[PDB]
Amino acid sequence: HINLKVSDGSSEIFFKIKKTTPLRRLMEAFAKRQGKEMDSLRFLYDGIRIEADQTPEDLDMEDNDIIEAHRSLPAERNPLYKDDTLDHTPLIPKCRAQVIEFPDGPATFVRLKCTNPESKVPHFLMRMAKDSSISATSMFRSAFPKATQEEEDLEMRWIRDNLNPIEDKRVAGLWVPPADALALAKDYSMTPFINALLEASS
């Protein structure tokens, strides 16, 4: 038996389980005390997403080790974002400004193309020049090409509840201010890309 600390950044709960019990018991223990479902969360240990069937003996967990609790995100992330520490500077000249004519007048956007490993159609990270708002939908679909519509609808519901959503029927998707866009970049491991999209000329 060992003591384990589980924290979601706001609340820390300490547990005690034997090294042969599944960590789902410790996952359901923390999730129940947050008022959330176990599937609604994912747990990290040294940056490794813990699966339910794994045990403290399966990993090399010692006493007082911390298990980070985060909300669930799709499993297959875009291999382009396997490194959140890449220098953002060479990505800025790849950003392009583009004018789009709307029923109420033209508007300027800034686009950054990102390789989609699942489709031949080009995918772009988009930024509106007027308010520097960034589409959270284009960020999510870029980082998780194999995501289901339910997995997206739950994420956008989380954006509206925890961030500052901006939705307009004239422009598709869910849009967030630059501060929220850099927070999503941390979850999606897209920091160098969003950092360059915000610093690009409009």
Binding site: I100, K120, P122, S138, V171, A172
Partner: peptide
């Protein structure tokens, strides 16, 4: 249809 400018426009208004 597959050019950057045209694909980006359809992506923001659909």
């Amino acid at each position: 249809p597959l050019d950057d400018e045209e694909a980006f426009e359809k992506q923001v208004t659909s």
